[PDB]
Structures are given as C-alpha cells and as structure tokens.
Amino acid sequence: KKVYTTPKKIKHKHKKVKLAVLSYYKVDAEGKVTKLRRECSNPTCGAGVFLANHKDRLYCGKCHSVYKVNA
Amino acid sequence: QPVNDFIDTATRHVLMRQGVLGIKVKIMRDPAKSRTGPKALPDAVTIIEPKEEEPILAPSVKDY
RNA sequence: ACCCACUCGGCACCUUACGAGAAAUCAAAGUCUUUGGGUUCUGGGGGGAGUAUGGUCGCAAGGCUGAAACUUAAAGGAAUUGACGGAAGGGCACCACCAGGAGUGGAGCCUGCGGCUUAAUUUGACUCAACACGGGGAAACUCACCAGGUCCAGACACAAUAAGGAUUGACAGAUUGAGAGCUCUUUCUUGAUUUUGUGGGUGGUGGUGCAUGGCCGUUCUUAGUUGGUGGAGUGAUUUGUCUGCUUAAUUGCGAUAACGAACGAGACCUUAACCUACUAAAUAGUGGUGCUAGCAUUUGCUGGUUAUCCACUUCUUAGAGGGACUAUCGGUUUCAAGCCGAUGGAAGUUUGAGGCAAUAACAGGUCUGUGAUGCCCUUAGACGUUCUGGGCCGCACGCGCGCUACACUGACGGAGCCAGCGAGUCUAACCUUGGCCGAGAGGUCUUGGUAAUCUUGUGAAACUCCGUCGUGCUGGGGAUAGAGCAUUGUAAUUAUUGCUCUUCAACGAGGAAUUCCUAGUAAGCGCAAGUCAUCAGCUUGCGUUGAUUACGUCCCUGCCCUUUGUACACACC
Numbered sequence: 081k082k083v084y085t086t087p088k089k090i091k092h093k094h095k096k097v098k099l100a101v102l103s104y105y106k107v108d109a110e111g112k113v114t115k116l117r118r119e120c121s122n123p124t125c126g127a128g129v130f131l132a133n134h135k136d137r138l139y140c141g142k143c144h145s146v147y148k149v150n151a
Numbered sequence: 152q153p154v155n156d157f158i159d160t161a162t163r164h165v166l167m168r169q170g171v172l173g174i175k176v177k178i179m180r181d182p183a184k185s186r187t188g189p190k191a192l193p194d195a196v197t198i199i200e201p202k203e204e205e206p207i208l209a210p211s212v213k214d215y
Numbered sequence: 216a217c218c219c220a221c222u223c224g225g226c227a228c229c230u231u232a233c234g235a236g237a238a239a240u241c242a243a244a245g246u247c248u249u250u251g252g253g254u255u256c257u258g259g260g261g262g263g264a265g266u267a268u269g270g271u272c273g274c275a276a277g278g279c280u281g282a283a284a285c286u287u288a289a290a291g292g293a294a295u296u297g298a299c300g301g302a303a304g305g306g307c308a309c310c311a312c313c314a315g316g317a318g319u320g321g322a323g324c325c326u327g328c329g330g331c332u333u334a335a336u337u338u339g340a341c342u343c344a345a346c347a348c349g350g351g352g353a354a355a356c357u358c359a360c361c362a363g364g365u366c367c368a369g370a371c372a373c374a375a376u377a378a379g380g381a382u383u384g385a386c387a388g389a390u391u392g393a394g395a396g397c398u399c400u401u402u403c404u405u406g407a408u409u410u411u412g413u414g415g416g417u418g419g420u421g422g423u424g425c426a427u428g429g430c431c432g433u434u435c436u437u438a439g440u441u442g443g444u445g446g447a448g449u450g451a452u453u454u455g456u457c458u459g460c461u462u463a464a465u466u467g468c469g470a471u472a473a474c475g476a477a478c479g480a481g482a483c484c485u486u487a488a489c490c491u492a493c494u495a496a497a498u499a500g501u502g503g504u505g506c507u508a509g510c511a512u513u514u515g516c517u518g519g520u521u522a523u524c525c526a527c528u529u530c531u532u533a534g535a536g537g538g539a540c541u542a543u544c545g546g547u548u549u550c551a552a553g554c555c556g557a558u559g560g561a562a563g564u565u566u567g568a569g570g571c572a573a574u575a576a577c578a579g580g581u582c583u584g585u586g587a588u589g590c591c592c593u594u595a596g597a598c599g600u601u602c603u604g605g606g607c608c609g610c611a612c613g614c615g616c617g618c619u620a621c622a623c624u625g626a627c628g629g630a631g632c633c634a635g636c637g638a639g640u641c642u643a644a645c646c647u648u649g650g651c652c653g654a655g656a657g658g659u660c661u662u663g664g665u666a667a668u669c670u671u672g673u674g675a676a677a678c679u680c681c682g683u684c685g686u687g688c689u690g691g692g693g694a695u696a697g698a699g700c701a702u703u704g705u706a707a708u709u710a711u712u713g714c715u716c717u718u719c720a721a722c723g724a725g726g727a728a729u730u731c732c733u734a735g736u737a738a739g740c741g742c743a744a745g746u747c748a749u750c751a752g753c754u755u756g757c758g759u760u761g762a763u764u765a766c767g768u769c770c771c772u773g774c775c776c777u778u779u780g781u782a783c784a785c786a787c788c
C-alpha cells in the first residue's frame with residue numbers, strides 16, 4: 081500500500097479526573113447539616129443534584145447540559 | 152418447454168473447512184403419472200394396435 | 216515372331232489363412248509346452264560407452280579385439296483414443312467475398328480507453344470474445360481517491376480497576392470548516408451499562424477470479440454425445456457413428472456387418488399473421504331511436520348529448536376451438552430424400568421473429584451484486600464507519616462507439632395532420648387534462664386517474680401542401696463565447712437542465728484503411744421504457760416512411776469435417 085505518515089502528536093482522550101468529591105455538605109458541631117453549592121430546580125432532578133461554580137456560572141450537571149440559572 | 156413441465160433444478164452452496172462447493176441437482180419426474188398437465192412428451196406418438204379380422208363370409212342379414 | 220497347354224529353375228505381385236505373432240504383419244516370421252532335421256553367429260534392463268586399458272592392423276584418418284568404477288526405474292517395441300501441424304482433399308457463413316446500399320475513417324462537439332497532468336485525478340476489462348462495457352447518464356449521496364474531523368456499532372471468557380466510584384454526559388469559553396465538550400479551562404453529573412489487559416471476535420468496494428461457489432461470456436450464425444443385441448480385435452478399441460446425394464441440421468435418402476433406439480437438432484413453448492364461425496362486454500365499439508346545433512332545405516349532408524332507451528359483435532378486447540401438412544398440378548435428380556415453377560391460399564425462406572438448448576473445453580470475466588466463500592492482510596493515529604471539502608469531468612496529444620453537418624430529393628415560415636411498445640400517488644405528492652398569467656422557459660387556480668375508465672386519439676417526427684430565399688463559407692452549418700430570465704435540488708462556481716438576444720468557427724463528400732446489412736429488411740424518422748430530485752448526443756423495445764442489389768460462389772477471411780504425421784497426453788502456452 082504505502083503505510084504511515086503523521087506530523088506527530090497523537091490525540092489523547094479524556095481523563096475524567098478522580099477526586100473523592102462530594103465533600104460539600106457541611107455539618108457543624110453535632111449534628112446540623114447545611115448543604116454547600118446551591119442545587120438545581122428542574123423537576124427531572126428533584127433537588128438532589130447541585131450546581132457547579134465557575135465564573136458567571138451556576139451550571140446544572142444532571143441536566144446533561146441544560147438550563148443556566150445564574151446568581 | 153418439457154423442462155418447465157418435468158425436470159427440477161436446485162443449486163446449493165455447502166461450505167466447509169477448505170472452501171465451498173456447489174450441488175446442482177436435477178430430477179426428471181415420470182411424465183406418465185403426471186396427474187395434472189400433459190401426461191407425455193411432445194415427442195411421443197403411440198400407434199394403437201388394430202385387430203386380426205376374420206373376413207370373407209357370404210353376406211346375410213340379422214333381424215331384431 | 217506370336218497363340219495355347221504342360222514342366223523345370225527364376226525376379227515379383229494377387230487372394231487367402233489351416234497356422235504364427237505383442238501387434239504391425241508373415242507361405243515363412245508355418246508345421247513351437249503335442250516344446251528335438253543338421254549346423255555357423257549374436258543378444259541377456261537403461262546409461263556409463265564402443266569410453267578406458269592392453270594387443271594387432273594402417274602413411275595418416277582410423278580399423279579389429281574390448282572393460283570396469285559409478286549411476287539409474289525405467290529405456291524400449293507394436294497398437295488405440297485424443298490433442299496439435301508453418302501437411303492434403305472437402306464444405307459452411309454477409310461477425311466471408313461477390314452485386315450493391317447506408318456509412319465510418321477527414322471536420323465540430325458528445326462519449327469511453329490510453330497518455331500526460333495531479334493532494335487525488337478510485338478501479339476491473341486490452342484481437343474476434345477490452346475501449347455508449349461493469350446496467351458506470353459521479354454536484355452531496357453513490358465512493359472505492361485525496362486534505363482534514365468524530366464514533367465503536369472491539370460479541371464473549373479469564374483477569375485487573377473499583378461502590379471512598381468501574382464508567383457516561385455537558386452549559387460558556389478557548390479551540391474547529393462546523394451550535395463536535397474531538398481537545399483543554401472550570402465542576403456539576405452519572406452508577407457498575409463501562410474502562411485497562413489477555414485470549415477470542417468482528418467489520419472491511421483491502422489482496423488473491425492463478426484458492427472457490429454461483430453467474431456469465433466464448434468455442435457455437437456449431438452439430439455433436441451415448442447405450443442394447445450382433446460382426447471384428449488377446450486388448451485398449453472398432454463397426455453402428457459411412458464414399459455419395461440431400462437439408463439450417465449425425466436433416467434425411469441411399470450404400471451397407473450391421474440392426475433397432477435414447478440425449479442434442481426436430482418436437483415444444485412465446486409473439487406477429489387468418490376466423491361476418493362459438494362465448495361476450497358503460498372500463499371496447501357499431502347501427503337505430505329519443506334530445507339538440509349548423510347548412511340545405513325535397514327526403515338530405517356534418518356534429519353534440521360517459522347511460523335517454525332498444526338492438527348488435529364487422530372493427531376492439533381474450534377464453535375455447537379451427538387453420539398449413541411446403542397442399543394441387545407439373546418440372547428435375549440415383550425418378551430416393553428433396554429442390555425448382557405455376558395455382559390456390561391469412562400465411563408456403565424452420566410461415567416471419569424469439570425463448571429454451573446435450574457432451575466437452577478456457578486458469579475468458581466477476582471476491583467492486585450478495586449476510587455466497589478458503590486463505591492472507593488490516594482492526595482504534597482503522598484499510599471499520601460516519602461528517603466537511605475536493606476529485607473521478609483535471610489537457611501538448613494517440614485510439615474506439617457516437618451526435619450534428621457541409622444544403623436547392625434543401626433551410627426557413629405558415630398550413631395540412633398520422634402511430635405502436637410503455638408507465639404512472641399510501642401511509643404520498645406519481646402520471647397530470649382543464650382556467651387564467653408570461654415572448655419564452657415557467658408560474659399559478661383546480662381536476663381526472665392505483666388506471667382498457669384519467670394523463671391520452673400520447674393531434675410524435677420524418678412526411679404532405681403554399682410561400683420566402685436562389686447558389687454566393689448563403690437565409691447551409693451551429694462550434695466557441697458575452698449578457699439576462701427560469702426550473703431541480705441543502706447546495707449548481709469547474710458553469711445540472713430549460714429559456715431569450717447577440718457572437719457566426721471547422722466542415723465545399725473526405726488518404727490508406729474498415730463496420731453493418733437480402734423485405735416492410737436497409738436506411739431515414741420520432742417516441743416510450745430503463746437510469747432519474749435534476750441530466751441522453753446511451754441503451755432496451757416500439758411504431759412511422761420505405762429503396763437499390765444477390766438468390767451466387769470459395770478469391771480474401773473465419774471456422775467445421777475427413778485423410779496423414781507425431782518422440783505431444785500438464786496435450787504446441
């Protein structure tokens with residue numbers, strides 16, 4: 081045939097990171113629980129899922145992409 | 152046309168460890184039995200065998 | 216000298232075969248396992264090799280006598296069937312001539328092939344039997360190519376990761392051709408569906424048609440294949456299956472150690488031809504009557520009225536039948552098969568044209584039709600797949616199929632006006648009459664038709680008729696090209712197609728060569744169908760107009776058939 085070329089630099093993938101995440105759930109000196117990071121209000125995800133915090137950003141994750149409430 | 156009327160063709164592809172091979176089967180059914188359709192080849196021309204006569208004999212007549 | 220009969224001894228042939236042989240053959244090559252007349256000579260698988268060595272002969276060249284080592288499963292004889300010949304005798308054929316026709320070959324463009332060019336210009340096929348072929352008329356798709364971007368649709372097993380999360384997704388931004396969360400920024404999400412690894416799978420228009428199936432093409436516009444009883448031969452085998460004649464035919468007649476058959480040809484099937492004979496029909500049509508228009512008027516002539524009734528089946532349609540069997544007569548030939556001519560007949564060239572079609576062969580073509588397939592290669596930076604854009608159309612040039620033409624049997628413009636094969640819309644927009652609008656192309660408003668019912672009588676074109684032009688590259692011819700309008704489509708630029716104005720090329724009948732064709736055929740003419748969103752200068756069919764010249768032959772060619780040779784048989788590659 082011919083076989084092989086490339087200007088090199090092979091595309092990686094997606095690491096998806098690790099994290100021991102959902103630490104955000106602050107409970108004080110026994111045993112009161114006030115959550116951290118405000119949650120979404122779309123009836124598909126009944127206020128269990130929360131919102132990411134970037135700049136200008138309160139983003140809904142479970143809503144795979146959708147709905148952009150902001151404050 | 153007897154082809155259509157009588158013989159039966161079939162092709163079958165049997166495939167084995169070494170390659171494949173084809174089976175071509177032909178069956179000519181007895182035109183005699185036939186049941187429905189022509190009972191004989193267009194070729195066929197049977198002549199019916201007559202009869203030895205005992206002719207001669209002077210006329211005469213018979214009444215009923 | 217000749218004739219005739221006979222007899223010795225000769226050079227030979229003929230027919231036979233009791234007999235011999237492996238056979239071809241042989242009056243010896245017979246009288247030979249039923250093995251003995253006398254005698255001289257030679258041979259003991261092939262090659263090594265008539266070589267080496269010695270002896271002898273000769274001027275010489277060389278003659279006679281004459282080993283072994285080693286190697287080798289065969290070499291060889293006669294015959295049989297096949298295959299082949301750059302060997303002989305016959306045939307057949309418009310993919311062969313003749314006698315002619317219409318051409319191609321020259322021109323413009325259309326189109327395939329090569330060549331070149333190219334990021335790529337995907338590829339199979341190269342004499343008949345490759346090159347308007349792959350149904351191959353590519354804007355995307357198709358698509359196999361090139362520049363680039365995603366996705367896994369990697370079943371399954373073991374193992375490893377890990378419920379503190381194995382894994383999925385993504386808003387905006389950066390980025391990308393791209394409103395791809397491909398990637399990264401940031402950080403919500405999801406829950407054991409995935410990930411990594413091994414084995415094992417799979418997809419692939421990747422390779423191999425020189426591994427295969429099937430299919431197709433070719434030999435073949437051919438006439439060949441076989442078996443029963445019998446004859447010949449130890450046999451493989453041969454005769455049947457043949458000199459001639461005769462057919463399109465191993466089609467027949469005839470000759471005859473052959474007789475009577477079977478596949479194939481023929482039969483058969485399909486279509487065009489005939490049917491005032493049968494069955495019929497508002498999805499076909501006719502005659503009459505109603506109803507009604509026009510012109511005549513004297514009755515008439517020419518139309519209208521998807522049912523106003525009644526009748527019919529010539530035309531139309533398709534069911535069952537009939538009909539031709541080269542008939543009747545007569546020429547001609549082995550007075551056989553047949554062939555020729557007249558007559559009759561819807562039709563007498565296998566009635567015209569097709570469908571099928573035995574045995575055998577080719578390394579013909581097809582892994583680019585198949586979820587037909589062996590093997591090999593590839594399988595995640597993919598040769599899988601999908602998305603964007605380009606390309607198969609690229610142009611000094613060679614070749615093949617074509618299309619349009621060089622005009623006056625013509626172009627133009629009026630006007631006359633006639634076919635047959637088709638096809639058309641359900642989970643959809645196909646065939647489209649009709650009414651308006653526009654020079655046109657086309658737009659628009661409705662309509663019939665899933666169809667003998669509607670498009671549609673498909674009012675097609677050559678063609679017919681009356682003009683205009685008047686032989687001048689002319690008003691023949693329409694290439695190239697500029698400008699504007701429309702249609703198909705997500706998209707038309709390298710210009711899909713259609714329209715209008717202008718531009719007005721080559722080509723003044725075409726070298727050597729070469730294709731096709733014998734009657735409603737040739738050629739001229741346009742349709743319909745395939746392909747198809749749009750595109751025919753292509754093809755498959757179809758009807759329209761309708762000639763000339765044979766009715767012969769073996770000269771060119773191509774192929775069959777015997778005879779003959781053969782050391783071929785993997786068969787002259």
Ligand SMILES: [Zn+2]
Nearest residue numbers: 120122140143
């Ligand atoms: Zn939400």
